[PDB]
Write a protein that binds this ligand. Structure first.
Ligand SMILES: Nc1ncnc2c1ncn2[C@@H]1O[C@H](COP(=O)(O)OP(=O)(O)OP(=O)(O)O)[C@@H](O)[C@H]1O
Ligand SMILES: [Mg+2]
Lengths: 99, 292, 151, 387, 49
């Protein structure tokens, strides 16, 4: 959109990280299936590299974005000013749990 | 006593200077051929090098036979040397400066207080010419006599990277050296250079005169350039590698620019501040002899 | 930053007078400061400072917030339409420790070193030939609307 | 009456306490108007960073709250040896050793305390990797050959921050007007061989440059990618490509940033696929094996600290200042201390020098005695030779 | 549970944040978790809310 870029940006955080999979085995077995081309989304895939994980790293860019969002959140009260920075530390925690 | 040929001591096969490369004992010239230089926007112009001080530092009363070549080569190319000006045994070279001194400089690179048996040594006249200049390394730390450690590196660049036209001009673009590389190539290079018997080079450099000198200066240009190269890597701001289709090019930025860096790094030898002052002095003297 | 800026204004005014050929009682030939260690921004000020940009003489910059304009000026020169001025500014930015100066300044430094043989002056110094620019901007800070007569 | 005791006595105490070993930060500039502490963080490309200074709400047993009211006893109910003139206390000049030793002990603990983590993270330093497609631009190209490409997301998530650490200009965008020499200059300036696609069809000489030089184009997305290139050869095709991992060590090469020696490469080759959990388990094991020596003051400080280290990532972790605005700055050659430019995997110099020799032992054929593969065959063993 | 870093829960400035998290974070129960993973693949007939 012309001027709602931050909103579209944040909405992109919701985009699925998986892949659409045709139901090959169910088709071979001639299992009942209402769709002319059966398939289901798989929320995430196998980690391909030896160490890096695409899923975790995606959640990492997500919390980076969210920390930029929280950091730009103007507040008036001092306590709100605190909870902002605490919220940022907590995100930095969540990223490690997720990884 | 080793006789000095009509050429230098460097003409003798005993004093060959050769870095290891591709599994063989390569001459410095055939290493420097591997080098290639990307130009950058910056320019080096060479200022006149100040005349080295008249002073020869006192050779303090030292009973021992100082290992001088080891001290110098480790101060210039040594991987681990530091506080090189704390001991100050470089001054000892001025024991050799005097006419008819008892002291001898052995081929071993040791300054014996008196001639001793079964230790070959350089011709005393040659060493005297050599000491009359290089004893001044002994005052590399004293505040009055310190060399500039920034501008001098311009000469280094010109003497290394500089094309003959850039050398005639006295001004070249700051360059960025690169070469096909094996792991630990600069460490290994510097250690091949620490083992060089450079007092042979410096002694021929100070003793030879006339055409016999000039014939030396062409013959050993690449050697001097290898010493300059190791110092350059020692002072280079950064030393990266590049993947280049299953090959690697080591790349140092930048030739001729002393970054004054002192924090150690795996890629190359590092100068402590003392090694910087020393190397600056060494370059002052050596470039002074090289351009006369 | 504020210090370097005030000095750049002093050096530019002085050079602006020197280039008019007037005799000057300058207390020092290059009035501007040399960073020995500074951040990016001071290096930018050092660079446009040494350039002696035409834009100062035209009063194109506003001195009400001097350093700001100076920073902005560097931003143009960093990506300047002119190749020579761009590469010159870049080169000055990458060697901030060097003191860039015009040949005409340099001869004054020589006269100074001649009159006082043991005078100290900053040793790291490049001598660039200045790049001419033909664009004579009109300008006038200070109150008064312009009453154009359009052709 | 007390000003004499502060200025002429407390001041020398402050002046010596300033030189103590562990008092490492600058404390104050004397300008309330402008002072802010320098704000270092331990950033990693593949993790979230830790500020050193943080308002983390640990109170260190109440050390962080400040009772300003403390000035009242100072001005009004305390004696000082100088204040007391006329009796004469005679000033105390405490032995250095008692603090010095303490400092050493601490410095000696926290020195080796990180070693096992540092060693493993050195090994796996080149091991992070980006998925990349390799489209083939001509007939009879093996699937490894061809133009290489990665999504902008992968570049932003791995390659970019590592460029910021490596301290190089951001790689040039290619616009299809881009001459091969410009791409050449780009890779020369930022030593990693990477350029970002921006817009427009890319000319064929440039395509030959990107193919011959293994340059990694960073496509915004994989949508009709062949339209982006001038496929005059008509061999390159949207269905014709090969997905594969590309290790960070296979693009970066920097001696103190990312271990890239062939020995450690072989070690990574022998490794099972890993996870932060497995890596942490390895580190906990190496710690379990080397039970470090500790002076009694070191055991004391260790229990004071005194537990978890597990949270922070160390994949290519560096010390780098943040801006107060929150952005992580590049290493400034004229500000940040030189030691911060490359954490040397947080290993000591001698440890590196030895480490190289160890790589020489590891890569040696004689110790390479795990054998792979076998041959079932039904021969008689007439003349038994193992070889 | 692992919702907060040490020692953010103890911290008095974090109180509003911590109460926020605690108001969201449900106790784990195998049946409910399994139901979520299974709902992902099971057909829906009555529309979810
Ligand atoms: N005026 C300038 N002079 C020299 N280099 C510059 C200049 N502006 C930017 N750079 C280079 O770009 C980097 C800064 O990027 P960028 O310009 O996006 O942000 P900035 O520092 O705020 O500058 P600007 O205000 O021009 O945006 C610096 O590392 C510097 O090398
Ligand atoms: Mg003044």
């Amino acid at each position: 959109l012309a001027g709602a870029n931050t909103i579209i940006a944040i909405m992109r955080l919701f985009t699925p990280q998986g892949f659409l999979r045709t139901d090959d085995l169910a088709i071979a077995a001639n299992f009942p299936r209402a769709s002319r081309n059966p398939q289901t989304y798989i929320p995430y895939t196998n980690q391909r590299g030896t160490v890096t994980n695409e899923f975790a790293s995606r959640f990492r860019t997500i919390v980076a974005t969210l920390a930029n969002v929280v950091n730009e959140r103007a507040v008036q009260d001092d306590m709100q000013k605190a909870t902002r920075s605490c919220t940022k530390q907590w995100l930095r925690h969540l990223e490690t749990q997720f990884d | 006593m080793l006789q000095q040929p009509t050429g230098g001591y460097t003409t003798l096969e005993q004093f060959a200077f050769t870095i290891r490369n591709d599994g063989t004992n390569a001459t410095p010239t055939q290493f420097l051929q591997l080098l290639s230089y990307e130009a950058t926007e910056n320019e080096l112009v060479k200022k006149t090098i100040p005349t080295p001080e008249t002073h020869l530092p006192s050779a303090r009363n030292v009973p021992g036979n100082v290992y001088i070549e080891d001290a110098i080569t480790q101060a210039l190319f040594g991987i681990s040397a530091q506080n090189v000006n704390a001991h100050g045994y470089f001054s000892r070279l001025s024991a050799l400066a005097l006419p008819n001194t008892s002291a001898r400089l052995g081929l071993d690179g040791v300054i014996y207080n008196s001639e001793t048996i079964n230790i070959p040594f350089y011709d005393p006249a040659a060493v005297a010419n050599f000491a009359a200049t290089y004893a001044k390394l002994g005052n590399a730390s004293t505040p009055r006599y310190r060399a500039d450690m920034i501008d001098i590196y311009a000469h280094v660049g010109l003497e290394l990277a500089g094309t003959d036209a850039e050398r005639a001009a006295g001004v070249m673009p700051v360059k960025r050296a690169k070469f096909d590389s094996w792991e630990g190539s600069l460490i290994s290079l510097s250690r091949d250079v620490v083992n060089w018997k450079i007092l042979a080079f410096l002694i021929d450099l100070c003793s030879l005169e006339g055409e016999a000198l000039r014939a030396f200066k062409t013959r050993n240009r690449d050697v001097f350039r290898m010493m300059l190269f190791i110092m350059s890597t020692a002072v280079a701001a950064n030393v990266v590698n590049r993947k280049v289709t299953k090959r690697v090019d080591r790349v140092l930025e930048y030739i001729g620019v002393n970054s004054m860096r002192t924090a150690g790094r795996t890629a190359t030898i590092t100068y402590d501040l003392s090694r910087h002052e020393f190397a600056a002095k060494f370059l002052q003297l050596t470039f002074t002899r090289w351009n006369a | 930053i504020d210090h370097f800026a005030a000095k750049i204004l002093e050096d530019w005014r002085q050079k602006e007078k020197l280039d008019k050929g007037a005799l000057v009682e300058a207390d020092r030939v290059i009035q501007r400061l040399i960073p020995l260690s500074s951040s990016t921004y001071v290096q930018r000020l050092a660079a446009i400072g040494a350039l002696y940009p035409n834009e100062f003489t035209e009063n194109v910059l506003d001195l009400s917030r001097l350093s700001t304009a100076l920073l902005q000026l560097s931003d143009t020169y960093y990506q300047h339409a002119n190749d020579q001025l761009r590469r010159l500014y870049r080169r000055m930015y990458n060697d901030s420790r060097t003191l860039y100066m015009t040949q005409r300044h340099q001869e004054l430094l020589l006269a100074q070193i001649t009159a006082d043989p043991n005078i100290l002056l900053y040793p790291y110094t490049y001598i660039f030939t200045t790049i001419p620019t033909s664009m004579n901007y009109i300008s006038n800070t200070g109150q008064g609307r312009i009453k154009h007569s359009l052709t | 009456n007390i000003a004499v005791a502060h200025t002429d006595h407390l001041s020398v105490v402050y002046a010596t306490m300033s030189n103590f070993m562990l008092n490492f930060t600058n404390n104050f500039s004397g300008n309330h108007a402008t002072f802010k502490p320098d704000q270092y963080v331990i950033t990693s490309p593949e993790g979230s960073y830790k500020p050193i200074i943080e308002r983390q709400g640990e109170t260190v047993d109440g050390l962080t709250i400040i009772d300003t009211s403390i000035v009242w006893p100072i001005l009004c109910q305390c004696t000082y040896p100088l204040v007391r003139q006329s009796i004469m206390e005679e000033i105390v000049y405490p032995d250095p050793s008692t603090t010095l030793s303490q400092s050493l002990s601490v410095a000696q603990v926290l020195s080796k305390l990180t070693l096992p983590d540092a060693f493993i993270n050195m090994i796996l330093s080149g091991g992070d990797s980006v998925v990349m497609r390799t489209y083939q631009t001509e007939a009879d190209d093996d699937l490894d050959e061809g133009i290489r490409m990665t999504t902008y997301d992968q570049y932003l998530s791995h390659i970019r921050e590592r460029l910021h650490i490596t301290n190089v200009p951001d790689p040039i965008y290619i616009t299809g007007a881009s001459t091969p020499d410009q791409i050449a200059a780009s890779v020369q300036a930022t030593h990693v061989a990477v350029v970002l696609y921006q817009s427009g069809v890319i000319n064929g000489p440039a395509s030959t440059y990107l193919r011959e030089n293994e340059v990694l184009v960073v496509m915004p997305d994989y949508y009709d990618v062949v339209s982006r290139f001038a496929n005059a050869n008509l061999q390159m095709n949207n269905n014709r490509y090969h997905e594969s991992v590309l290790e960070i060590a296979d693009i970066f090469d920097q001696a103190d940033f990312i271990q890239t020696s062939d020995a450690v490469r072989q070690l990574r080759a022998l490794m099972p696929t890993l996870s932060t959990s497995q890596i942490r388990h390895a580190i906990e094991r190496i710690a379990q094996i080397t039970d470090v020596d500790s002076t009694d003051y070191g055991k004391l400080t260790l229990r004071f600290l005194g537990t978890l280290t597990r949270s922070l990532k160390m994949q290519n972790a560096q010390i780098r200042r943040i801006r107060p605005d929150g952005t992580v700055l590049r290493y400034d050659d004229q500000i940040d201390i030189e030691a911060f430019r490359w954490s040397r995997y947080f290993l000591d110099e001698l440890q590196l020098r030895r480490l190289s020799v160890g790589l020489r032992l590891i890569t040696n054929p004689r110790i390479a005695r795990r054998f792979n593969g076998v041959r079932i065959m039904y021969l008689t063993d007439d003349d038994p030779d193992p070889d | 549970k692992r919702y907060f870093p040490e020692n953010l829960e103890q911290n008095q400035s974090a109180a509003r944040l911590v109460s926020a998290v605690k108001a969201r974070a449900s106790e784990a129960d195998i049946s409910s978790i399994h139901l979520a993973i299974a709902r992902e693949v099971s057909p829906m007939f009555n529309v979810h809310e």
